[PDB]
DNA sequence: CCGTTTCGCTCAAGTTAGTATATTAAAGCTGAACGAGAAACGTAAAATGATATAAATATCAATATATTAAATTAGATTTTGCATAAAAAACAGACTACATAATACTGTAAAACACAACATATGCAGTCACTATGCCGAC
């Protein structure tokens, strides 16, 4: 299609559908979260929890478009998920 | 071919994610009104093109010889650029003399108002009428 991420018609899609189509297949896999489950969204802060330990932090703050220095460490939170395994580094 | 149900969409009310400015200071942009000198135009007048023909005047080569305007000097001199310096007049730097304001001090009338006993119109105090439909009563 025009767009990287079109639907069975060929044709654009709305961001409010796309994140809708994952809400399904979340609570048909079966999981089990504490509070409000996870969403489309939160792929972008998996994305750069990854990002952050893969190559470095200075690379997971350009890629999300951020600027700023205050968000690079709330955006790196866990909330209470996994604990922050503290390596010997 | 047509009807029925699911699915792609957008409206409506909650649930989260992100970034952070106000005054000074000094311009810069652009619509609209303001104020002369030179040349292209144009009608009118002056000079010239038009036009031709026998007779009058100029066209010109090739060289001797007297004549002359005038650039080319070459020396003479007013003209022109530039101060130098003193006689002569302007003008601060002094100073007493002279008429004039700010001030020193005496001399005198009178403005400006409290104080006090009366005098009394006038606003306030107290009651009834003027002027005309309410309220209450019938229709």
Do not use: C, N
Request: net charge positive; charged share 35%.
């Amino acid at each position: 299609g025009e767009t990287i991420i079109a639907s069975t018609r060929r044709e654009p899609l709305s961001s409010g559908t796309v994140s809708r189509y994952f809400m399904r297949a979340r609570k048909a896999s079966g999981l089990s979260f504490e509070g409000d489950p996870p969403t489309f969204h939160e792929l972008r802060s998996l994305s750069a929890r990854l990002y952050e330990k893969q190559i470095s932090d200075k690379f997971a703050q350009h890629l999300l478009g951020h600027k700023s220095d205050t968000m690079a460490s709330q955006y790196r939170d866990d909330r209470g998920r996994e604990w922050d395994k503290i390596e010997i580094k």
